[PDB]
């Protein structure tokens, strides 16, 4: 059986995706747990799966379900956004994680420029992952959640294990989770926390209307959104920076015309290889997908770069084009029921980070050969451990 994932490299799509997409856009594969799954790799079939609610995210956590990887969190964390809705906490979460919050844009700006000024002061080479993108992501999310900036680095520490993509259960993941939860639970009891998502969650927790809502859930929300948001924005910006560095005339164009930076980031999103695995769903019924009858109880993996590099939807898919007619129609944020609630913020993080970097380091380039980057393995994202650059 063809094994997944194909490659841990986040800088280059494997040739085998284009071949697999045309001939077998749904194809049986084996996951690292040894489970069988259906890998879907065309825009047509990927959208089908994500729009069909009978292909369930929640049910991937069912006992004895075939698994893409080992659970690193309680089985109910996989249903976090549903739980959030059922508790009536939805539009509050959404309010907290909008990039439009007064002062947030300028905070991101000033934070980005300050990180860059420190790198320019220290001298090249600079590691843009550990000393720019990830610290930017972490700073942002502390702001968003209303927790102290100095607390960011320690919560960040859990993510190299929390977002592993493991064949086997991970002892450390439970230890870290319990500790982070305990942390968030204290944050909720802290009267000084009056801003951001945790400032809100804290005041809803006092109101007896929300007596039905557990303390586990409130604290879980904080841990979940921090980790998910920090890993995704930090990881996406890092590999987006590589794509940009490798396209000097695009780098030059955006530096000259910063108004095109949103169009550039949308393209960088479309071609991004940050998700290491397809998005998993469990079929809750027998459902036809292309030439395959997917059976109740079976795992399906939605390969985002399958869809995103599909020439049937995106002409010249390997090329970054700033004048595409339907540019936001990629699947980098998913589709349907579980479309990323952080997508607006994820955009602005990348847009502002890139704008800062292009202005401070207009001559940015890799300071090592591309084949020297060390790609993290058995992780839910594809990222280089370090991104050395000069300017």
Residues at the contact surface with ligand TPF, assessed by CB under 6 A:
72-73, 77-78, 80-81, 162-163, 224, 228, 232
Q: Give the dihedral sign, CA 43/46/51/52.
A: positive
Q: Give which of ligand TPF, ligand HEM, none residue 341 binds (C-beta under 5 to 8 Å, depending on kind).
A: ligand HEM
Q: Per rule CB under 6 A, is residue 218 in the interface with ligand HEM?
A: no
Q: Is 351 known as a binding-site position?
A: no
| Tally of CB atoms within 10 A around 173 | 19
Whole-angstrom distance, CA of residue 4 vs CA of residue 58: 22
Q: Per rule CB under 6 A, is residue 345 in the interface with ligand HEM?
A: yes
- Asked if residues 264 and 250 have their Cβ atoms less than 8 Å apart, the reply is yes
- Asked if residues 280 and 68 have their Cβ atoms less than 8 Å apart, the reply is yes
Q: Which of 373, 300, 318, 216 is nearest to 48 (CA)?
A: 300
Q: Which is nearer to ligand HEM, 208 or 351 (CB)?
A: 351
Chain residue whose CB lies nearest ligand HEM: 342
Q: Is 81 known as a binding-site position?
A: yes
Q: Which of residues 294-333 bind ligand HEM (CB under 6 A)?
A: 332-333
Applying CB under 6 A, which part among 174-182, 205-213, 232-240, 368-376 lies near ligand HEM?
A: 232-240
Element (H, E) at 365: strand 365-366
Q: Per rule CB under 6 A, is residue 54 in the interface with ligand HEM?
A: no
Whole-angstrom distance, CA of residue 237 vs CA of residue 346: 9
Least distance to ligand HEM, CB of residue 369, Å? 27
Q: Is 46 known as a binding-site position?
A: no
Q: Give which of ligand TPF, ligand HEM, none residue 229 binds (C-beta under 5 to 8 Å, depending on kind).
A: ligand HEM
Q: What share of the chain is helix, strand, coil (3-state, %, to 5)?
A: 55, 10, 35
Size of the site for ligand HEM (CB under 6 A): 20
Element (H, E) at 98: none
Helix crossing, 104-122 with 343-360: angle to 10°? 40
Least distance to ligand HEM, CB of residue 193, Å? 17
Q: Per rule CB under 6 A, is residue 81 in the interface with ligand HEM?
A: yes
Least distance to ligand TPF, CB of residue 70, Å? 9
- Asked if residues 266 and 243 have their Cβ atoms less than 8 Å apart, the reply is no
Whole-angstrom distance, CA of residue 171 vs CA of residue 115: 34
Q: Name the DSSP class of 6.
A: -
Q: Which of residues 93-122 bind ligand HEM (CB under 6 A)?
A: 97
Q: Give which of ligand HEM, ligand TPF, none residue 345 binds (C-beta under 5 to 8 Å, depending on kind).
A: ligand HEM
Q: Per rule CB under 6 A, is residue 236 in the interface with ligand HEM?
A: yes
3-state DSSP call for residue 388?
strand
Binding-site residue ranges: 72, 80-81, 232, 281, 296, 338, 340, 380
| Residues contributing to the site for ligand HEM (CB under 6 A) | 57, 81, 97, 225, 228-229, 232-233, 236, 274, 279, 332-334, 338, 340-342, 345-346
């Amino acid at each position: 059986l063809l094994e997944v994932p194909f490659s841990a490299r986040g800088d280059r799509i494997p040739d085998a995706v284009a071949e697999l997409r045309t001939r077998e856009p749904i194809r049986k594969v084996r996951t690292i747990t040894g489970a069988e799954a259906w890998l879907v790799s065309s825009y047509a079939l990927c959208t089908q799966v994500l729009e069909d609610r009978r292909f369930s995210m929640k049910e991937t956590a069912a006992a004895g379900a075939p698994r893409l990887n080992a659970l690193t969190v309680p089985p109910e964390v996989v249903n976090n956004m549903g739980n959030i809705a059922d508790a009536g906490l939805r539009k509050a979460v959404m309010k907290a994680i909008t990039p439009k919050a007064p002062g947030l844009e300028q905070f991101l700006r000033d934070t980005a420029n300050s990180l860059l000024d420190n790198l320019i002061t220290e001298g090249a080479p600079a590691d843009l992952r550990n000393d720019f993108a990830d610290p930017l992501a972490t700073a942002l999310h502390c702001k968003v959640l209303g927790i102290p900036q100095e607390d960011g680095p320690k919560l960040f520490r859990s993510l190299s294990i929390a977002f592993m993509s493991s064949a086997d259960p991970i002892p450390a993941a439970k230890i870290n989770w319990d500790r982070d939860i305990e942390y968030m639970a204290g944050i909720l009891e802290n009267p000084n926390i009056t801003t951001g998502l945790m400032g809100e969650l804290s005041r809803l927790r006092k109101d007896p209307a929300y007596s039905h809502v557990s303390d586990e859930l409130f604290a879980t929300i904080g841990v979940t959104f921090f980790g998910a948001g920090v890993i995704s924005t930090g990881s996406f910006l890092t590999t987006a920076l590589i794509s940009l560095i490798q396209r000097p005339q695009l780098r030059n164009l955006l530096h000259e015309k910063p108004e095109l930076i949103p169009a550039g980031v949308e393209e960088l999103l479309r071609i991004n290889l940050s998700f290491a695995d397809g998005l998993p769903r469990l079929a809750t019924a027998d459902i036809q997908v292309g030439d395959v009858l997917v059976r109740k109880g079976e795992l399906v993996l939605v390969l985002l770069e399958g869809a995103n590099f599909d020439p049937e939807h995106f002409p010249n898919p390997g090329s970054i084009e700033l004048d595409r007619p339907n540019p936001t129609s990629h699947l980098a944020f998913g589709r349907g029921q579980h479309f990323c609630p952080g997508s607006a913020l994820g955009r602005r993080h990348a847009q502002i980070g890139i704008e800062a970097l292009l202005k401070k380091m207009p001559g940015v380039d890799l300071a090592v050969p591309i084949d020297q980057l060390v790609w993290r393995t058995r992780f839910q994202r594809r990222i280089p451990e370090r991104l050395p650059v000069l300017w």
